[PDB]
Amino acid sequence: LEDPMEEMTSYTFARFLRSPETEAFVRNLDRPPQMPAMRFVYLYCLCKQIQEFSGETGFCDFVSSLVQDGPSLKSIYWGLQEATDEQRTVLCSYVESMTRGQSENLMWDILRNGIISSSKLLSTIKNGPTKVFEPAPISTNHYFGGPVAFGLRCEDTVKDIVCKLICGDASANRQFGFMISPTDGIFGVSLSLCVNVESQGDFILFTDRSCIYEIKCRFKYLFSKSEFDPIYPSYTALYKRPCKRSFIRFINSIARPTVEYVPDGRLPSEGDYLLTQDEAWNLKDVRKRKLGPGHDLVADSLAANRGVESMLYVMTDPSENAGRIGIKDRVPVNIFINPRHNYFYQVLLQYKIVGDYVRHSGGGKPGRDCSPRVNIVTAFFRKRSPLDPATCTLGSDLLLDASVEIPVAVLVTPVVLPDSVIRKTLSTAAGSWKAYADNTFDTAPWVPSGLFADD
């Protein structure tokens, strides 16, 4: 009779918005029900139920201290309407710490209904928000066996490298819950890694020396230390002579390369998410022109980013080095991000939401700006040779999981994000939310006027 969360799966935001109890107070409101308030009331109600069989009363006691047997939804909707942003962001990071442990849990899912997640922002812009008001499958998790299993299996080791090697410290928060954007209650984010975060016992205090790191492991670049493998040669060349020239040949050793040469004022394709205008990278052809016609957004971003220089890190080969994976070399390179690609959006929301936390959490210094830095780590692995030692340490002393493949390169790319671009993007996205909420509810909650479209 155990797993009471298997039961709470009917109590999604959408459903709450459709409750008779909901409708109760929204009848006797003056205004179209406002929206972060509505989301926070829902959260309070889902908690009131959950807290029983999970003991953690904490979220609710906060909501309670805001209003002065349980208080009536009108008392609650109204104290949440009057709350200061700090107080909002507290509530959000109650929900964050409340989910930190288990991305596997079912609550992670119930919370995701009605929230434009960051992975789904570009899709949501292009196709609209219906998938965002829809249940999410088993996946499975059983015998995963391919690109997506490669993803999960490694996305650890790459944090180990980022934390320990790239910035000199392994004491960094790697587990992140679900972070609702506190000021809007519409968007959501889950961080991969983020450096310079501090604690409050259960809470994670983002400081303003925060660095976000989106991790991607390029499965299409997997290869073996073995004659006949096609990438291997161009790689041993990289190893021995690390630099732009060598690395170009590596990037280009597969059918579909991950960097794309697109010259200033041309529109980039969509292949994937790295671009470069640096000439050395140019071996054939011509590009549609990216102008006026809408491309204004991708144009402002392209401009802001094509000055960005990324760092390549060439790792030492564990086999040639008594099992040591250290930073052998540090080639700087001229590669930046594809503002057309899915990731650019995912990483823009990750930057917008954390900005918000950082700001309204004890933490902003007048005169100075607290937007974090964002980067995309693009990790290159090879397969395990028979030659490689059974055991391996990153650096001197960090074990490396025996199931994981060998890290070979790591390419970190700063992302630059004009407030210009953020405002519109999120804005046309949130009207899309409104849009659907309007003819699915009856009482659609009104969007905060800071995601209002225009001036």
Tab-separated table of C-alpha atoms in Angstrom:
chain	number	residue	atom	x	y	z
A	1	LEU	CA	0.000	0.000	0.000
A	2	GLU	CA	3.167	1.957	-0.401
A	3	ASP	CA	4.249	4.796	-2.672
A	4	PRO	CA	1.623	7.512	-1.968
A	5	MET	CA	3.120	9.642	-4.723
A	6	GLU	CA	1.782	7.081	-7.304
A	7	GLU	CA	-1.564	8.586	-6.254
A	8	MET	CA	-0.818	12.320	-6.387
A	9	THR	CA	-0.269	12.090	-10.170
A	10	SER	CA	-3.735	13.458	-10.864
A	11	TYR	CA	-2.989	16.700	-9.006
A	12	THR	CA	-1.174	18.692	-11.659
A	13	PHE	CA	-1.313	22.439	-12.090
A	14	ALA	CA	-3.786	22.157	-14.960
A	15	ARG	CA	-6.142	20.061	-12.890
A	16	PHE	CA	-5.923	22.387	-9.878
A	17	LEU	CA	-6.821	25.275	-12.200
A	18	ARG	CA	-9.891	23.073	-13.065
A	19	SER	CA	-10.928	22.210	-9.465
A	20	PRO	CA	-14.202	23.232	-7.911
A	21	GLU	CA	-12.164	24.386	-4.822
A	22	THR	CA	-10.002	26.532	-7.215
A	23	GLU	CA	-12.887	28.164	-8.965
A	24	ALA	CA	-14.121	28.817	-5.333
A	25	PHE	CA	-11.878	31.892	-4.696
A	26	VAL	CA	-11.360	32.871	-8.374
A	27	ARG	CA	-15.063	33.550	-8.499
A	28	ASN	CA	-14.771	36.193	-5.732
A	29	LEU	CA	-11.609	37.848	-7.139
A	30	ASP	CA	-11.581	41.683	-8.589
A	31	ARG	CA	-8.994	40.681	-10.892
A	32	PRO	CA	-8.223	37.961	-13.374
A	33	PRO	CA	-6.199	35.644	-11.140
A	34	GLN	CA	-2.546	36.795	-11.256
A	35	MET	CA	0.371	34.556	-12.015
A	36	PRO	CA	3.074	33.642	-9.935
A	37	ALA	CA	0.478	33.723	-7.160
A	38	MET	CA	-1.641	31.036	-8.824
A	39	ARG	CA	1.287	28.764	-9.241
A	40	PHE	CA	2.306	29.243	-5.683
A	41	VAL	CA	-1.200	28.517	-4.387
A	42	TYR	CA	-1.230	25.243	-6.364
A	43	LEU	CA	2.195	24.324	-4.867
A	44	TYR	CA	0.757	25.012	-1.382
A	45	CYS	CA	-2.148	22.660	-2.135
A	46	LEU	CA	-0.063	19.829	-3.561
A	47	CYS	CA	2.184	20.151	-0.508
A	48	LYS	CA	-0.653	20.129	1.983
A	49	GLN	CA	-1.451	16.676	0.629
A	50	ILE	CA	2.102	15.450	0.103
A	51	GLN	CA	3.469	16.672	3.472
A	52	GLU	CA	1.353	14.047	5.263
A	53	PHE	CA	3.221	11.006	4.004
A	54	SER	CA	6.546	12.822	3.583
A	55	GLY	CA	6.727	14.675	6.972
A	56	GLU	CA	8.474	17.827	5.603
A	57	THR	CA	6.017	20.608	6.493
A	58	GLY	CA	8.485	23.371	5.546
A	59	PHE	CA	7.128	24.868	2.308
A	60	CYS	CA	3.704	25.348	3.908
A	61	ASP	CA	4.965	26.948	7.016
A	62	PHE	CA	6.495	29.542	4.808
A	63	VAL	CA	3.209	30.146	2.911
A	64	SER	CA	1.614	30.289	6.420
A	65	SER	CA	3.934	32.908	7.833
A	66	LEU	CA	2.910	35.039	4.828
A	67	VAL	CA	-0.727	35.280	5.919
A	68	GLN	CA	-1.688	36.809	9.260
A	69	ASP	CA	-7.023	24.270	10.543
A	70	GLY	CA	-5.409	25.818	7.328
A	71	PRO	CA	-6.287	29.321	5.936
A	72	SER	CA	-8.848	29.756	3.150
A	73	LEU	CA	-7.583	29.849	-0.423
A	74	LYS	CA	-8.514	33.518	-0.592
A	75	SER	CA	-6.286	34.329	2.450
A	76	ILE	CA	-3.546	32.321	0.800
A	77	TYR	CA	-3.917	33.516	-2.773
A	78	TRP	CA	-3.724	37.000	-1.248
A	79	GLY	CA	-0.748	36.755	0.928
A	80	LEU	CA	1.164	35.189	-1.983
A	81	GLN	CA	-0.025	38.084	-4.186
A	82	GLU	CA	1.480	40.580	-1.705
A	83	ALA	CA	4.765	38.676	-1.125
A	84	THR	CA	8.195	40.249	-1.725
A	85	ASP	CA	10.374	38.652	-4.345
A	86	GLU	CA	12.893	37.299	-1.727
A	87	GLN	CA	9.971	35.475	-0.180
A	88	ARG	CA	8.947	34.163	-3.525
A	89	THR	CA	12.420	32.900	-4.260
A	90	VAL	CA	12.523	31.218	-0.822
A	91	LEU	CA	9.375	29.242	-1.769
A	92	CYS	CA	11.017	28.238	-5.084
A	93	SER	CA	14.062	26.923	-3.426
A	94	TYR	CA	11.936	25.074	-0.942
A	95	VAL	CA	10.628	23.302	-4.069
A	96	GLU	CA	14.215	23.014	-5.319
A	97	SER	CA	15.686	21.386	-2.249
A	98	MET	CA	12.491	19.369	-1.977
A	99	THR	CA	13.332	17.842	-5.381
A	100	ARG	CA	17.128	17.870	-5.280
A	101	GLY	CA	17.504	14.288	-4.406
A	102	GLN	CA	15.465	12.464	-6.927
A	103	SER	CA	14.946	13.437	-10.570
A	104	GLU	CA	13.619	9.919	-10.607
A	105	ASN	CA	10.771	10.850	-8.278
A	106	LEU	CA	7.233	11.310	-9.484
A	107	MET	CA	6.855	14.738	-8.010
A	108	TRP	CA	9.417	16.028	-10.439
A	109	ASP	CA	6.764	15.215	-13.054
A	110	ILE	CA	3.634	16.646	-11.370
A	111	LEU	CA	5.491	19.964	-10.954
A	112	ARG	CA	6.440	19.972	-14.663
A	113	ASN	CA	2.905	20.186	-15.873
A	114	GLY	CA	2.172	23.711	-17.001
A	115	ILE	CA	5.749	24.794	-16.763
A	116	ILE	CA	7.810	25.805	-19.829
A	117	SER	CA	10.975	23.911	-18.991
A	118	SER	CA	14.208	25.158	-20.543
A	119	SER	CA	14.666	22.053	-22.778
A	120	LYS	CA	11.227	22.856	-24.112
A	121	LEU	CA	11.467	26.645	-24.628
A	122	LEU	CA	12.545	26.637	-28.282
A	123	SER	CA	10.056	23.895	-29.047
A	124	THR	CA	7.435	25.811	-27.173
A	125	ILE	CA	8.200	28.914	-29.230
A	126	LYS	CA	8.033	26.982	-32.463
A	127	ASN	CA	5.154	24.616	-31.754
A	128	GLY	CA	3.214	26.049	-28.854
A	129	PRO	CA	2.597	24.848	-25.308
A	130	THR	CA	0.488	21.695	-25.586
A	131	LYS	CA	3.290	19.206	-24.961
A	132	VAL	CA	3.938	21.358	-21.864
A	133	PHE	CA	0.473	20.539	-20.543
A	134	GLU	CA	1.084	16.737	-21.267
A	135	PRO	CA	2.180	13.633	-19.166
A	136	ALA	CA	5.757	12.295	-19.681
A	137	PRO	CA	6.287	8.492	-20.540
A	138	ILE	CA	8.198	5.643	-18.739
A	139	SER	CA	11.218	6.432	-20.934
A	140	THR	CA	12.288	3.206	-19.406
A	141	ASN	CA	15.702	3.192	-17.634
A	142	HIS	CA	15.886	-0.574	-18.024
A	143	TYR	CA	18.352	-1.530	-20.719
A	144	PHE	CA	19.119	1.882	-22.074
A	145	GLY	CA	21.993	1.185	-24.489
A	146	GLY	CA	22.999	4.067	-26.810
A	147	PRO	CA	23.472	7.811	-27.324
A	148	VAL	CA	21.183	8.597	-24.381
A	149	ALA	CA	22.753	6.055	-22.085
A	150	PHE	CA	26.153	7.509	-23.091
A	151	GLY	CA	24.760	10.857	-21.998
A	152	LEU	CA	23.894	9.877	-18.450
A	153	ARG	CA	26.817	7.506	-17.847
A	154	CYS	CA	29.345	10.327	-18.459
A	155	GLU	CA	27.771	13.582	-17.496
A	156	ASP	CA	29.353	12.966	-14.066
A	157	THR	CA	33.029	12.549	-15.093
A	158	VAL	CA	32.741	15.803	-17.073
A	159	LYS	CA	31.601	17.636	-13.907
A	160	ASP	CA	34.586	16.068	-12.088
A	161	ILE	CA	36.848	17.527	-14.778
A	162	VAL	CA	35.112	20.969	-14.820
A	163	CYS	CA	35.123	21.297	-11.007
A	164	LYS	CA	38.438	19.728	-10.095
A	165	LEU	CA	40.649	20.579	-13.064
A	166	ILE	CA	39.301	23.634	-14.902
A	167	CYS	CA	38.537	25.659	-11.775
A	168	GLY	CA	40.732	24.244	-9.018
A	169	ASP	CA	38.033	22.808	-6.691
A	170	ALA	CA	35.954	19.540	-6.277
A	171	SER	CA	33.765	20.925	-3.376
A	172	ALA	CA	30.989	22.240	-5.680
A	173	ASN	CA	27.262	21.591	-5.765
A	174	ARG	CA	26.412	19.165	-8.597
A	175	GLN	CA	22.942	18.007	-7.507
A	176	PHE	CA	20.227	20.521	-8.334
A	177	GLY	CA	16.506	20.288	-7.800
A	178	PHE	CA	13.789	21.858	-9.912
A	179	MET	CA	13.972	25.671	-9.955
A	180	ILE	CA	10.775	27.509	-10.876
A	181	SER	CA	11.354	31.102	-12.083
A	182	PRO	CA	10.193	32.921	-8.937
A	183	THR	CA	9.071	36.105	-10.584
A	184	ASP	CA	6.833	34.359	-13.173
A	185	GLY	CA	5.886	30.812	-12.142
A	186	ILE	CA	5.758	29.897	-15.840
A	187	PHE	CA	9.383	28.841	-16.583
A	188	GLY	CA	11.458	26.130	-14.958
A	189	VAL	CA	15.087	25.092	-14.978
A	190	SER	CA	17.288	22.251	-13.703
A	191	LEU	CA	20.993	23.011	-13.695
A	192	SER	CA	23.661	20.647	-14.884
A	193	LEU	CA	26.539	22.087	-12.919
A	194	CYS	CA	27.069	25.418	-11.367
A	195	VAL	CA	30.173	26.681	-9.584
A	196	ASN	CA	30.512	29.176	-6.675
A	197	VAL	CA	27.263	28.208	-4.992
A	198	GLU	CA	26.951	28.366	-1.224
A	199	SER	CA	24.565	26.783	1.332
A	200	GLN	CA	21.885	27.532	3.939
A	201	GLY	CA	21.694	24.043	5.334
A	202	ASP	CA	18.975	22.792	2.907
A	203	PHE	CA	19.121	25.750	0.550
A	204	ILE	CA	21.616	26.557	-2.216
A	205	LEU	CA	22.591	30.212	-2.228
A	206	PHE	CA	23.720	31.273	-5.733
A	207	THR	CA	26.327	33.977	-5.288
A	208	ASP	CA	27.284	36.434	-8.035
A	209	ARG	CA	30.399	34.575	-8.914
A	210	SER	CA	28.191	31.766	-10.168
A	211	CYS	CA	29.211	29.868	-13.294
A	212	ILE	CA	26.730	27.706	-15.079
A	213	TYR	CA	27.992	24.788	-17.167
A	214	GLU	CA	25.622	23.035	-19.619
A	215	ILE	CA	27.131	19.540	-20.298
A	216	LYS	CA	26.924	17.689	-23.672
A	217	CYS	CA	28.907	14.507	-24.483
A	218	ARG	CA	29.273	14.120	-28.187
A	219	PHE	CA	28.445	10.565	-28.807
A	220	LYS	CA	28.980	11.009	-32.569
A	221	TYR	CA	32.681	11.587	-31.706
A	222	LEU	CA	33.139	8.271	-29.901
A	223	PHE	CA	36.035	6.202	-31.260
A	224	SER	CA	38.644	3.545	-30.455
A	225	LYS	CA	42.467	3.583	-29.953
A	226	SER	CA	42.676	1.154	-32.917
A	227	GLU	CA	44.068	1.120	-36.456
A	228	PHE	CA	41.183	1.422	-38.795
A	229	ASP	CA	39.143	3.581	-36.602
A	230	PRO	CA	38.537	6.813	-38.653
A	231	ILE	CA	38.782	9.491	-35.943
A	232	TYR	CA	41.719	7.936	-34.149
A	233	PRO	CA	44.494	9.305	-36.541
A	234	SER	CA	43.351	12.915	-36.491
A	235	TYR	CA	43.183	12.555	-32.734
A	236	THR	CA	46.767	11.291	-32.180
A	237	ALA	CA	47.691	14.319	-34.292
A	238	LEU	CA	45.711	16.553	-31.897
A	239	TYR	CA	47.387	14.893	-28.955
A	240	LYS	CA	50.914	15.413	-30.207
A	241	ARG	CA	50.421	18.858	-31.731
A	242	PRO	CA	47.559	20.576	-29.928
A	243	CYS	CA	46.209	23.724	-31.614
A	244	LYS	CA	43.568	25.271	-33.881
A	245	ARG	CA	44.896	23.520	-37.027
A	246	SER	CA	44.970	20.051	-35.426
A	247	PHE	CA	41.624	20.501	-33.709
A	248	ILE	CA	39.924	21.580	-36.969
A	249	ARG	CA	40.853	18.235	-38.521
A	250	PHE	CA	39.466	16.433	-35.438
A	251	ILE	CA	36.180	18.283	-35.388
A	252	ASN	CA	35.977	17.497	-39.140
A	253	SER	CA	36.811	13.800	-38.900
A	254	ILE	CA	33.173	12.730	-38.802
A	255	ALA	CA	30.380	12.935	-41.404
A	256	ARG	CA	28.504	15.653	-39.619
A	257	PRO	CA	30.905	18.019	-37.856
A	258	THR	CA	29.809	19.948	-34.746
A	259	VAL	CA	31.407	23.315	-35.612
A	260	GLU	CA	30.145	25.224	-38.637
A	261	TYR	CA	31.906	28.023	-40.516
A	262	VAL	CA	29.451	30.848	-41.104
A	263	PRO	CA	30.856	34.244	-42.133
A	264	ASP	CA	29.556	37.483	-40.556
A	265	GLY	CA	26.080	38.434	-41.866
A	266	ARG	CA	25.233	34.958	-43.130
A	267	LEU	CA	22.541	32.850	-41.455
A	268	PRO	CA	23.884	29.659	-39.755
A	269	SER	CA	22.228	26.320	-40.572
A	270	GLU	CA	20.882	24.052	-37.733
A	271	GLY	CA	23.260	20.963	-37.888
A	272	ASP	CA	24.290	21.732	-34.370
A	273	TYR	CA	25.247	24.413	-31.903
A	274	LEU	CA	28.789	25.587	-32.479
A	275	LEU	CA	29.750	28.246	-35.019
A	276	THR	CA	32.915	30.047	-36.025
A	277	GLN	CA	33.750	32.949	-38.318
A	278	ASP	CA	37.487	32.398	-37.932
A	279	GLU	CA	38.566	31.721	-41.502
A	280	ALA	CA	40.917	28.742	-40.897
A	281	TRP	CA	37.764	26.746	-40.516
A	282	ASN	CA	36.481	27.177	-44.017
A	283	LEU	CA	36.441	24.474	-46.593
A	284	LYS	CA	33.612	25.012	-49.099
A	285	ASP	CA	30.572	26.959	-50.212
A	286	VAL	CA	27.943	29.618	-49.456
A	287	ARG	CA	25.196	30.564	-47.037
A	288	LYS	CA	21.639	32.040	-47.218
A	289	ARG	CA	21.707	35.635	-45.952
A	290	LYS	CA	20.500	36.421	-42.491
A	291	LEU	CA	18.776	39.660	-42.671
A	292	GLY	CA	15.891	41.893	-41.714
A	293	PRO	CA	13.179	39.377	-42.222
A	294	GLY	CA	12.826	38.252	-38.605
A	295	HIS	CA	16.406	37.101	-38.279
A	296	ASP	CA	16.795	40.188	-36.142
A	297	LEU	CA	16.862	37.990	-33.049
A	298	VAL	CA	19.494	35.547	-34.305
A	299	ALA	CA	21.340	38.646	-35.622
A	300	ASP	CA	21.621	40.451	-32.274
A	301	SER	CA	22.772	37.204	-30.641
A	302	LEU	CA	25.219	36.347	-33.423
A	303	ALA	CA	26.711	39.803	-33.016
A	304	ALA	CA	26.987	39.566	-29.194
A	305	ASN	CA	28.690	36.148	-29.381
A	306	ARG	CA	31.187	36.043	-32.201
A	307	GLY	CA	33.952	37.524	-30.092
A	308	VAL	CA	33.732	34.766	-27.571
A	309	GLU	CA	36.738	32.533	-27.526
A	310	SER	CA	36.348	29.040	-26.159
A	311	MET	CA	38.993	26.968	-24.343
A	312	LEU	CA	39.957	23.524	-25.521
A	313	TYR	CA	41.400	21.147	-22.965
A	314	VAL	CA	43.399	18.246	-24.191
A	315	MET	CA	43.551	15.497	-21.548
A	316	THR	CA	46.540	13.191	-20.931
A	317	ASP	CA	46.162	9.653	-22.192
A	318	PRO	CA	45.686	7.337	-19.122
A	319	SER	CA	47.444	4.489	-21.002
A	320	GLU	CA	50.598	6.499	-21.775
A	321	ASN	CA	50.616	7.961	-18.196
A	322	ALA	CA	50.102	5.292	-15.498
A	323	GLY	CA	46.326	5.994	-15.492
A	324	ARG	CA	46.464	9.764	-15.140
A	325	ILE	CA	43.930	11.986	-16.777
A	326	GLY	CA	45.182	15.535	-16.256
A	327	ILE	CA	44.945	18.694	-18.361
A	328	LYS	CA	47.804	18.088	-20.793
A	329	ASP	CA	47.094	21.230	-22.860
A	330	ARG	CA	44.992	24.369	-22.927
A	331	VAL	CA	44.409	25.596	-26.520
A	332	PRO	CA	42.260	28.769	-26.779
A	333	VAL	CA	39.941	28.718	-29.814
A	334	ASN	CA	37.548	30.955	-31.643
A	335	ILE	CA	34.239	29.110	-31.516
A	336	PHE	CA	30.945	30.452	-30.290
A	337	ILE	CA	27.361	29.384	-29.891
A	338	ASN	CA	24.569	28.870	-32.489
A	339	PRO	CA	21.798	31.264	-31.497
A	340	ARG	CA	19.472	29.233	-33.788
A	341	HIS	CA	20.101	25.941	-31.954
A	342	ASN	CA	17.978	24.402	-29.212
A	343	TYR	CA	20.771	24.781	-26.636
A	344	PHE	CA	21.014	28.518	-27.006
A	345	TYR	CA	17.513	28.733	-25.582
A	346	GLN	CA	18.026	26.127	-22.888
A	347	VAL	CA	21.136	28.022	-21.702
A	348	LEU	CA	19.419	31.443	-21.978
A	349	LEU	CA	16.654	30.320	-19.556
A	350	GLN	CA	19.216	28.726	-17.248
A	351	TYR	CA	20.903	32.120	-17.206
A	352	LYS	CA	17.676	34.160	-16.773
A	353	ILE	CA	16.316	32.069	-13.839
A	354	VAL	CA	19.600	31.879	-11.884
A	355	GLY	CA	20.061	35.579	-12.447
A	356	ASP	CA	16.699	35.984	-10.658
A	357	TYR	CA	17.667	33.731	-7.738
A	358	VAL	CA	21.076	35.436	-7.374
A	359	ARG	CA	19.444	38.845	-7.327
A	360	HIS	CA	16.643	38.209	-4.776
A	361	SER	CA	18.668	35.969	-2.501
A	362	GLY	CA	20.591	38.117	-0.005
A	363	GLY	CA	23.004	38.571	-2.855
A	364	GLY	CA	23.212	41.591	-5.171
A	365	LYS	CA	25.639	44.476	-4.829
A	366	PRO	CA	24.446	47.917	-5.773
A	367	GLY	CA	26.106	49.208	-8.806
A	368	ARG	CA	27.240	45.802	-9.845
A	369	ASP	CA	25.607	43.075	-11.817
A	370	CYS	CA	24.797	39.590	-10.681
A	371	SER	CA	23.953	37.752	-13.837
A	372	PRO	CA	26.022	34.551	-13.646
A	373	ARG	CA	28.319	33.367	-16.468
A	374	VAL	CA	27.064	30.528	-18.659
A	375	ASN	CA	29.197	28.021	-20.586
A	376	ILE	CA	28.717	24.927	-22.619
A	377	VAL	CA	31.107	22.133	-22.012
A	378	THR	CA	31.283	19.783	-25.040
A	379	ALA	CA	33.021	16.613	-23.869
A	380	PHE	CA	34.859	14.203	-26.091
A	381	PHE	CA	35.371	10.643	-25.100
A	382	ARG	CA	37.008	7.574	-26.602
A	383	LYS	CA	36.415	3.914	-25.763
A	384	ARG	CA	38.532	1.835	-23.341
A	385	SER	CA	41.576	0.170	-24.967
A	386	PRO	CA	42.881	-3.213	-23.763
A	387	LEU	CA	46.142	-1.212	-23.267
A	388	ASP	CA	44.529	1.157	-20.653
A	389	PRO	CA	45.151	0.423	-16.933
A	390	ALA	CA	42.244	-1.185	-15.168
A	391	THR	CA	42.117	1.867	-12.824
A	392	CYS	CA	42.166	5.635	-13.508
A	393	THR	CA	42.433	8.930	-11.667
A	394	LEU	CA	41.434	12.356	-12.953
A	395	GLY	CA	44.247	14.589	-11.705
A	396	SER	CA	46.320	12.730	-9.082
A	397	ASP	CA	43.743	11.253	-6.808
A	398	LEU	CA	40.155	11.294	-8.032
A	399	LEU	CA	39.083	7.711	-8.972
A	400	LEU	CA	37.318	7.353	-12.356
A	401	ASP	CA	34.338	4.986	-12.669
A	402	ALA	CA	35.313	1.696	-14.293
A	403	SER	CA	32.179	1.696	-16.431
A	404	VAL	CA	32.811	5.193	-17.898
A	405	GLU	CA	34.689	5.803	-21.158
A	406	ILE	CA	37.905	7.838	-21.263
A	407	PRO	CA	37.684	11.707	-21.408
A	408	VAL	CA	39.860	12.956	-24.226
A	409	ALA	CA	38.955	16.565	-24.748
A	410	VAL	CA	36.702	19.099	-23.055
A	411	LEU	CA	35.718	22.283	-24.936
A	412	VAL	CA	34.260	25.042	-22.875
A	413	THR	CA	32.289	27.793	-24.693
A	414	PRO	CA	31.207	31.028	-22.978
A	415	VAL	CA	27.717	32.127	-23.970
A	416	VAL	CA	26.786	35.861	-24.205
A	417	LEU	CA	23.057	36.813	-23.824
A	418	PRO	CA	21.806	40.293	-24.724
A	419	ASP	CA	19.037	41.354	-22.376
A	420	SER	CA	17.462	42.509	-25.633
A	421	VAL	CA	17.204	38.820	-26.742
A	422	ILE	CA	16.130	37.413	-23.372
A	423	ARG	CA	13.207	39.843	-23.013
A	424	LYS	CA	11.709	39.099	-26.365
A	425	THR	CA	12.322	35.438	-26.435
A	426	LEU	CA	10.726	34.705	-23.025
A	427	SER	CA	8.050	37.218	-23.882
A	428	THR	CA	6.812	35.613	-27.075
A	429	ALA	CA	7.114	32.277	-25.249
A	430	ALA	CA	4.898	33.411	-22.267
A	431	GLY	CA	2.198	34.852	-24.533
A	432	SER	CA	2.148	31.370	-26.132
A	433	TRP	CA	1.543	30.099	-22.602
A	434	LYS	CA	-1.254	32.635	-22.033
A	435	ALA	CA	-2.608	31.784	-25.477
A	436	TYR	CA	-3.274	28.171	-24.626
A	437	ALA	CA	-4.296	28.698	-21.012
A	438	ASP	CA	-6.981	31.050	-22.398
A	439	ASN	CA	-8.921	28.509	-24.356
A	440	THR	CA	-8.196	25.526	-22.086
A	441	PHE	CA	-9.347	27.256	-18.954
A	442	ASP	CA	-11.750	29.305	-18.182
A	443	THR	CA	-10.055	31.193	-15.851
A	444	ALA	CA	-6.539	31.324	-17.335
A	445	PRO	CA	-4.188	33.098	-14.940
A	446	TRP	CA	-2.798	36.486	-16.152
A	447	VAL	CA	0.940	36.690	-17.001
A	448	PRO	CA	3.151	39.131	-14.984
A	449	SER	CA	3.661	42.315	-17.044
A	450	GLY	CA	7.392	41.826	-17.311
A	451	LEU	CA	6.877	39.050	-19.845
A	452	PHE	CA	4.395	41.291	-21.602
A	453	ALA	CA	5.285	41.646	-25.299
A	454	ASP	CA	6.899	44.883	-26.629
A	455	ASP	CA	8.417	48.145	-25.244
